[PDB]
Amino acid sequence: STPSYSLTPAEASAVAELTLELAAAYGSFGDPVLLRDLPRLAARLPEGVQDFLREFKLADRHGHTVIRGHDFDQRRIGPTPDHWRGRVRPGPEFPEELLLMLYSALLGEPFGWATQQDGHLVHDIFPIRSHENDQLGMGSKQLLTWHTEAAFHPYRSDYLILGALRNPDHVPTTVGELDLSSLSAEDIDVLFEPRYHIAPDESHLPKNNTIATEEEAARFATIQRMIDERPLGPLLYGSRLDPYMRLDPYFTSVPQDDTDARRAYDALFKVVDSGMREVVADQGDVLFIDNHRAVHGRLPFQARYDGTDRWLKRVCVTSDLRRSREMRATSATRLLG
Amino acid sequence: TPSYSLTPAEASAVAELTLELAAAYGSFGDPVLLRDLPRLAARLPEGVQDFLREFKLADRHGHTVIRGHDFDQRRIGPTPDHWRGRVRPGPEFPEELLLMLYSALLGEPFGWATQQDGHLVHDIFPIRSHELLTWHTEAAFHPYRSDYLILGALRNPDHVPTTVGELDLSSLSAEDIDVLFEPRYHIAPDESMIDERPLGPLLYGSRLDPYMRLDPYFTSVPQDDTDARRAYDALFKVVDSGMREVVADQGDVLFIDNHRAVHGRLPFQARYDGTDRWLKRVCVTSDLRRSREMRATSATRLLG
C-alpha cells in the first residue's frame, strides 16, 4: 500500500530530545531566527526520517505518508484546551509544534492564512463547544466531507502536516487519492481542460476584510478578479500519465450545458469517493498530505469538552513562498490575507 | 549589497567537504546524491547557511556573493576547449558539487534538456567555434524559468565583470508601474508539446516592491498600446541606467535572484590556451513540481 515510517524507540527518543532542546533555546515562533534556522535544525533529525521524507517528496507518487511512534509526553503536553483564543503562546506543547515546523522545512516552507486562528503557523485542531455545529477543523458532530485544501486558490498548500497529540477514541482522518486506471482516456482529457468553476470558501472572500487602503486592495486584487471573471479551470493537471488533482465537490460548478464536463466529473467524483481511506492518526503519529494528490476530510465524533479530547496540530506547506507575494503584506510575513 | 567573506577556516572546511563528497558519489547521475543534497548542504559552515537563508527570505536584494573559497587551481586543471566530448565528472567535480549544495539551500537544481546535454552544472568558458553588452532575465518568456542562478568562478584572471541590475522603483511613477503589472506584452522564446500563447506582464508580485521578467531583445508591445510602450520605455531607462559591473573573481560564488535582477556579460579578449575565465552555473527552482508537465518523468530535473 502506501509507505510509512515507524520510529524505533531510539529514534523517538532522539526526536523528543531535539524537540525539547529547541523549545528551550528559542522563545516563540515570533522569533525570526527560528524561522530562518528551521531547515538547518531539521537536519539534526534522525537521518532515516530525513531520507524517508525526502524520498516521499521527490518520488511525487503517493498522496500521503505517516511517521509513527513519536513520543508525545502526555503529562508535559497537558489538557486539550477549551479554545484556541486566549492561550499563552507558546503552550507546553511547543516541542510538538516545533516538530511539525522542522518537518515542514524538510518539505518546503511553512505558511498560514491570516484569517485562520490569528495566522499561527502551527494551528490547532480540537473541539470547541461553541463551534459544535460547524463543518470545519474545530468541529466534531458534523462530517467533514473530503476536499483538496483551498482548491480554488492558486497559492493553496502543496502539503499539509497533521500531528496527533492525542486521539483517545481513534477517530480517523479520511484521505483519498486518484486511481487513474479507473477513468476513461476520454474523461481524463476533459478533466485536463478549463471547463470547471471552483468557488472560494467564505473564508477567502476579499469583501470579508478592510475595503479601503491601497495595500489591502492590491493584495486581494487577484482573488477579486477571479470572483468577477469566473474563469474556468481544470480538475486534473501535471502529467497525463499521473495527474495532480484539485477537487472540492461542494464548491465546484460544472457548467449546466457542458455535457462532457458533467459526465467526466461524475466519473472522477465516483472514483475518488470509492477510493477514500480511513487513516488513523493516533497519538505520536504525524500525517503528511500531498495537497496535489490527495483529498482529505474527517469523520463525525462525540466530543467531551473536559480536556481529554482529540487534539491535532496542523501546518500548511508551500514549495514556493515567493509565488504568493502579491497576497502577502510584506516580503517577510508568511501569512496570506 | 550583502556579501559573505569566508575565513580561511571556513574556506578549508568547505574544500574538505566538497572533496570528501566528490570521492563518495560517482557523478550527478547518482540519484542518491540528488536525494542527499539538502542534508549534505547542512554540513557546510553554519554562517554560510544562515547567510544564504537570510538572502532567500529577505527577498530584498538582486544578488549576493560568497567570497574567498579555496578553488585548488592545480587539481582543477586547464580550462577545456569544449563541453561536448568532454568526460563528466571532471577534476573540477568538487566545485560543481559545491554549487549543487548551494542550490539545495536555495531550492532545487534543474536544467534544460537542450543546453549542454542537460548537465545540471553548465560550463561558461571561451569556445573558439562558438566565438555582448546586453542584459536579461533568464528564460524571461518561460513560466518555469529559474528562480535563482548560481555562478561559481573557478578562474577569472582578467577580472572580467558580470553585469547585474535591479529595479529602482522611485524613478518610476505609479501610473507606469500599474500599466506594467498588466498582461499586455509578448516575450519571445529562443533556440531552447505545451506551447506559445498569452500576453504576460513585465512587473508582478507587490506593486510597492515588484519582481520583473525583462528580456529587451525579445520583448514586443502592440503598436496600439501607447500607455504600455511609454511605461515600458520608462522601465528600460531605469533598468539599463542602473546596471552594475560585478566581478566574479576566482573563489567567488555569485547568487542572482532571477526575479529581481537581470544579468549579462561583458565582451573580453580570450586566448584559448587553457588559462581563460571558467565559471560554473546551476539553475535553481523553488518548485520542481510546478514544471511536471514539461518533464519526461517524475524524477528528471530537465525541462523539455
Ligand SMILES: [Fe+3]
Ligand atoms: Fe481541510
Ligand SMILES: [Fe+3]
Ligand atoms: Fe544569461
